[PDB]
């Protein structure tokens, strides 16, 4: 048996049961055997008729197509990476401020 996986509709798939779609939350997702982690929200990046997912410049998946209801979604990271903590000495006090 010789199979391939590429950006096209799936023909033969494994025996895994689907479940409900959860939006605007940090979840693990498995779309057509493509796994990932992040937040799923609606978007407008109209695809080609056959296209299943779209990446970005960093070669990371950016948008995906729902297989059952042919609706585009997009994936954003769970992590906010611009937080800074103003603190006096932990010896003096245990109070902080957040930027």
């Amino acid at each position: 048996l010789s199979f391939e996986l590429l950006n096209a509709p799936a023909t033969v798939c494994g025996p895994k049961k689907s479940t409900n779609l959860v939006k605007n939350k940090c979840v693990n997702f498995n779309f057509n055997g493509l796994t990932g982690t992040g937040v799923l929200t609606e978007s407008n990046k109209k695809f080609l008729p056959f296209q299943q997912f779209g990446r970005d410049i960093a070669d990371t998946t950016d948008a995906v197509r729902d297989p059952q209801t042919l609706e585009i979604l997009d994936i954003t990271p769970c992590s906010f990476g611009g937080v800074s903590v103003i603190t006096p000495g932990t010896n003096t006090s245990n109070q902080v401020a957040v930027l």
Binding site: T37, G38, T60, P77, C78, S79, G81
Partner: protein, 49 residues
């Protein structure tokens, strides 16, 4: 010399550049749990940066 001249000239100098910060885990692993748990048996190459 018998006369003179007043001349105004310009000089330009850099003083500073941009300040940046890098998140090690987000750049390497990117919100993965299989990664960032393998990137814990590596050393302290993220505090030293």
């Amino acid at each position: 010399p018998t006369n003179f001249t007043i001349s105004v000239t310009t000089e330009i100098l850099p003083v500073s550049m941009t300040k940046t910060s890098v998140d090690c885990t987000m750049y390497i692993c990117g919100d993965s749990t299989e990664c960032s748990n393998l990137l814990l048996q590596y050393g302290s190459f993220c505090t030293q940066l």
